Design a protein around this ligand. Structure first.
Ligand SMILES: Nc1ncnc2c1ncn2[C@@H]1O[C@H](COP(=O)(O)OP(=O)(O)O)[C@@H](O)[C@H]1O
Ligand SMILES: Nc1ncnc2c1ncn2[C@@H]1O[C@H](COP(=O)(O)OP(=O)(O)O)[C@@H](O)[C@H]1O
Ligand SMILES: Nc1ncnc2c1ncn2[C@@H]1O[C@H](COP(=O)(O)OP(=O)(O)O)[C@@H](O)[C@H]1O
Ligand SMILES: [Mg+2]
Ligand SMILES: [Mg+2]
Ligand SMILES: [Mg+2]
Lengths: 413, 412, 412, 412
């Protein structure tokens, strides 16, 4: 009725329709599909469709629906799967009564009301609780290459950790995995868990807005006053989708691909999940790196945004050192507040023992090390197979927080 | 009805008013085909099905349908298919196929995938004992050029018992069609469809042949069969899509490639997996732009598939065949498939392989004294047993039971 | 017929309507031709055959034929052709060449090719023994500059015994025509066709010489006789196609090269090989842009040809001539054309060379004792035999039987 | 004529209708020529080199010729010529120079350019006895900085056996050219024709100095003499051509260099070889560095020339002048310009050089006893005579029969 699509191809369509707001969405009038206005020029506007672009033609009419895309949240979506758009995935069910219609884009808390985090958030993995340590309210990231340990360690964390609500966002990832995450979490955890699932075949928009859907649901269950655990698998899939949308809309190319929209819109998403006046969100974001280098565009940006980073190395997965986290290269920015002085000092001594062996390792292999002429090299060797049973852990094992402390005190001696 | 206004070398563009995207057209005097890929308000970019030599400005385009659909049916078993669905072998009669299928279908719904828990034996001892294939697992074979990819698919063509074998040979040597017909017996060739487009063929016909292989494998999946799909150098599809996507005016997001080859590789690889009715277990061969595993398409296909088998050139020069690097290889479902003593025997064997590659320069130069480290002596004493368990000739196939009993014997 | 509106150094833009792509035109005040590459509405982008340095704006184009066709006949034997197709011998009267045909031809059908199982005796002893070649395959010589490619083609040209030999010299040192013409006797020159372009010649004639050499070789193939196409530096064709593609407005995708180079190599290299009627055994040399085999164009030619002889500079400096590195090299038909104990002996001789290369540090500074590895003691005992087997001089030639019995002698 | 439309900083545009390409136009306020490089419809591109700042919108041009020409003649001996072709020494008058050559000629017909057969006498005992030059060989000396390039190069100037030497110095400074030409006497400046352009001159004149020296040496070839051309620093020819080609607007293909540099080096240094009348024996210089390792100009120059000399650094940090490392350097045309006994006596000395290198790094750690090998002990007894034969002072010139008999008394 209003405008006409004049340009079809790639990821974005372009239509002639005047007096368009930005962000408002539009039904393709003979086709039931609908599209969001992402960028406006004088009379031609860039739209981004929700579905496939095939089948369209020039002059196809474009009706009007709403001024902002909002999702529909409620208390009645625990234990239930949600799409990236906001719809429920499963069709066996009777549809819920979700009463509260929330906008997708919202504001972080005031920086003066976000209190200092000083309570440890127990995950269950011995390395990431003993050496590094989380806190109720931080947002930690898991940095790895392709197929190293990210989804296996996030499954261990979801198995071991406990929170009032658990929001788990499987964005950009293979469809085989939505049943493995429903398999390894129990019935009591499925009583309090919302999955937000977007497979990698889905369009740019669903794979781009599923992260904002999961963050909005976590903010809703925060505002009731509950400690909610957010877990987002491959936030770099959001980054790739924002890349190809922003490049198709005609933007420049800074820091290896990646328009300014990506690096300017990551903190508008990652700053929304932390401590708050009522409740808190403990977010865990996994990051895929374009090589094994940690110094990616997106890897370095997300490392400079978050509150702690767990870097997993492929060269430790070649040796079956699982979980493959690299202790010298990873860090946790709040463990000096959330734990006492004995644990922090013992963790410091164990980290320095690991780095000391990593310096001593190569000249043992080619056969030039001499015992006796260095007191702290031998101390890093005499303990080494004792510390590795603390630093590497089976998948079907959870560890208590007091066994972790006593194991670290026995290791560090 | 409209007329061509330029020819660019890869794609053409034309003055078609109000044309559908995806629709294909006949170039009216000379009997060829092209299809719409982009629209600029009256000027459509078209990708021709053939070579572009001979064309001129003002050449008409008659209309033929809204979608290039292939003619599929049950009489494809035992015969060879061109990259866009046509039969190749002119020696025999044209087959009769009843149904039409488009090349672009949706993956099965993620709630209906039913996590894979049954082993798929291959015949290679390294991808039985130390890696293990599930029925529904999609696997990749990552190597450089001439490292052993095709040799290993030839090993696991006559070793894997599946109901329908749909083999795609996109972007490779014309000489090989006969060699992959000289490794398959008639008890295998009677159930094997062999889709093949070679390196000569146009960029559309190497782009749109992996979709033909997946569509045929989905027709044989929906009947209820366990299909074994296997493609040769899916990076030839990736390079054809690079060429067309750069000719159509897209940027260069990573290592040479447009974003549309990164966003259209999952919606080909995600269709081959476990399903409610039937299953497709697929094996994708991936060529790397060097011997680095961190190629862009190598990295993306490693982050899509359910298992990667990395073959290195170093082991090929060492005459260690098949050249599988056990450290860089992984199978994402081995633990859901094998028994637990099998799993810990596999982990101990990979520990022994890594420990020998630690202590090898310590024993060769002469500093390793026999008795210092209580795992390196295990590795040294079991080196040759591990090595003739890992290596295998092309015409030797192993079963599952003999492989795991030799694994238990070698690892302890 | 049309004027010229742009002259750009390589691509000139004529304003002439209804022009067919592939057609060539004359610049009518002169006798120099130009071939159409791309078109627009009424502006065709075309490439001149000679250099561009004498042209002005309004300069007409007479129409010549719609495709560029060389004239081939049976009287090209013993002649000298350039990359356009003209004779170079002014001292000899021009022959009678009744047929004409275009330079762009499809390969044989992939099923009408056959599995090659007959050896091609080169004469070089190392290649014949350890690596070996089949009648109808495409071997490829990879080296640096000045490592010894050309010398090995001269050796392999005196030694081989094909019916017709079509030696192409593309983008090469003009001094060498008489040196490749002096190592041939008259008994081989009477059956050999020689196609010579030079590094001085422009980016079309250096680009079009490979296609005319392969067209002449396909003519003598279609007469039904085993021909031998030897091509000197096919990478000069790759450089010329890079310049033509980048002048025509193509993007870099890998190492400086456009997509059109990587799309135009496989059809050139894939029209040679087996055939229903005859065979065309091809030996291509590839100049790697440094002394490394992971050149973009070196890797893409290795992933097309079936077999590769990788020469190294570290052996050429140490007077290991010819400088074939036996570990880096391969031949994809070795297992198929020769007997089984020959395959076993060659495989463990290659393994013996590799296991000396992983020992010799223990010998140069004294860390090796005799009786702990009997294979290594046998290797150190037999190295003088083997480096009197791998090395041979240029005028040395050995038949196939003496090569096999010397291999059986050299590894016992 | 026409006037300047705009100046885009480096390249300028001017409306000259029906203006050819290659032509040179005269700016009307000053004495500054400029070159057309690309032609549009009625608005040609045009390239200034001297000075850009004092320019208008409306500054005029003036037509001179079809393209640029220089004045060659027999009275060029003992001169200094600019890269334009102007005589640099203004203290004398340019004599009756009657002939009129262009800068761009073709190399001879390769059938007429016949095999090079007789040795070129050079003077330096290393390049004359161990390696050997030829009459028509294009030697390229690879030097560092501080190895003794200019002193050796002056020995080549003075000790040569050629009728005319032609010297070009392409990128150099005034102290550098004066300290070079103050090393060779008036008896050598009688036959020499210096073509000097320095590192303050614009890049067009440094690019044209190579062509100017080549053309005047071809003129001295066509009247039947042995020309000895010496381009100093083709590295800086390549830097000048890179800067011109990038300023014209041309894509980077390899290491910072446009396609025009890589396609302009063969048509430069193929012109300097054997000929049907006379011959020109060329010797180029490339400056290799220690901050690069690839240096694409060094690789391309090594691919186009035939025979190269590597001047290493540590052969100068212990004062071994001339600093030629035999075994790292080689000449191709040696086996047909030397006799057989001189060939076998030359290979023996380089075998002894490599042999004492091996035995010396064996013995200086302490793993050698005197008495192992007679090739080692003959190397021991002949080291002082080898190092006495290779070492040659700045004033010492030897003949060729003395060189052969000194080689025969160093082979013993
Ligand atoms: N802690 C671990 N224990 C056992 N296996 C592991 C562990 N971490 C990684 N792996 C092995 O590595 C493979 C790939 O890990 P995955 O979690 O799928 O990577 P991604 O980070 O890409 O999702 C898994 O199949 C797994 O078997
Ligand atoms: N198991 C094996 N036994 C013997 N040779 C092998 C084996 N695996 C690889 N090769 C060698 O590698 C060659 C080329 O491998 P191929 O599979 O054709 O490479 P690509 O991966 O490029 O298709 C084989 O012809 C053979 O020479
Ligand atoms: N088999 C050999 N025996 C002795 N010398 C050789 C041999 N092969 C090459 N060489 C030396 O190497 C030089 C250059 O080899 P060539 O093949 O011309 O290099 P390119 O590969 O660049 O053409 C030759 O002049 C020759 O002296
Ligand atoms: Mg994952
Ligand atoms: Mg293959
Ligand atoms: Mg050569």
């Amino acid at each position: 009725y209003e405008g006409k699509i004049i340009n079809i191809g790639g990821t974005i369509i372009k239509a002639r329709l005047p007096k368009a707001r930005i962000g408002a969405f539009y039904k393709i009038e003979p086709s039931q599909r609908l599209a969001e206005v992402i960028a406006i020029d004088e009379d031609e506007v860039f739209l981004l469709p929700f579905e496939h672009v095939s089948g369209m033609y020039c002059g196809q009419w474009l009706s009007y629906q709403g001024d902002e895309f909002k999702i529909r949240v409620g208390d009645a979506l625990l234990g239930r799967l949600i799409d990236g758009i906001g719809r429920p995935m499963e069709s066996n069910i009777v549809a819920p009564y979700l009463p509260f219609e929330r906008s997708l884009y919202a504001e972080p808390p005031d920086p003066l009301l976000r209190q200092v985090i000083d309570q440890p958030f127990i995950l269950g993995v011995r390395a990431i609780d003993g050496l590094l340590t989380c806190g109720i309210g931080q947002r930690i990231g898991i940095f790895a290459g392709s197929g190293v340990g990210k989804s296996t360690l996030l499954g261990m964390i979801c198995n071991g950790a406990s929170a009032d609500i658990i929001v788990l966002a499987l964005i950009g990832e293979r469809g085989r995995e939505v049943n493995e995450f429903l398999a390894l979490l129990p019935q009591s955890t499925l009583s309090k868990c919302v999955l937000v699932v977007t497979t990698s075949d889905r369009p740019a928009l669903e794979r781009m807005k599923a992260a904002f859907t999961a963050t909005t649901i976590a903010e809703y269950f925060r505002d009731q006053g509950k400690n909610v655990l957010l877990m987002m698998d491959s936030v770099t899939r959001y980054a790739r989708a924002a890349r190809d949308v922003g490049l198709a809309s005609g933007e420049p190319d800074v820091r290896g691909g990646f328009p300014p929209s990506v690096f300017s819109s990551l903190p508008k998403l990652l700053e929304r999940a932390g401590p708050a006046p009522k409740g808190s969100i403990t977010a865990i974001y996994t990051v895929l790196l374009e090589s094994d280098n940690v110094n990616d565009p997106i890897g370095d940006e997300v490392r400079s945004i978050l509150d702690g980073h767990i870097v997993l190395t492929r060269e430790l997965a070649e040796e079956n050192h699982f979980p493959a986290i690299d202790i010298g290269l990873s860090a946790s920015r709040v463990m000096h507040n959330v734990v006492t002085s004995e644990h922090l000092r013992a963790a410091a001594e164990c980290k320095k023992l690991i780095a000391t062996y990593k310096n001593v390792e190569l000249l043992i292999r080619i056969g030039e090390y001499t015992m006796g002429q260095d007191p702290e090299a031998d101390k890093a060797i005499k303990n080494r197979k004792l510390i590795q049973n603390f630093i590497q852990q089976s998948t079907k094992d959870i560890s208590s927080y007091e066994k972790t402390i006593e194991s670290l005190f026995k290791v560090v001696a």
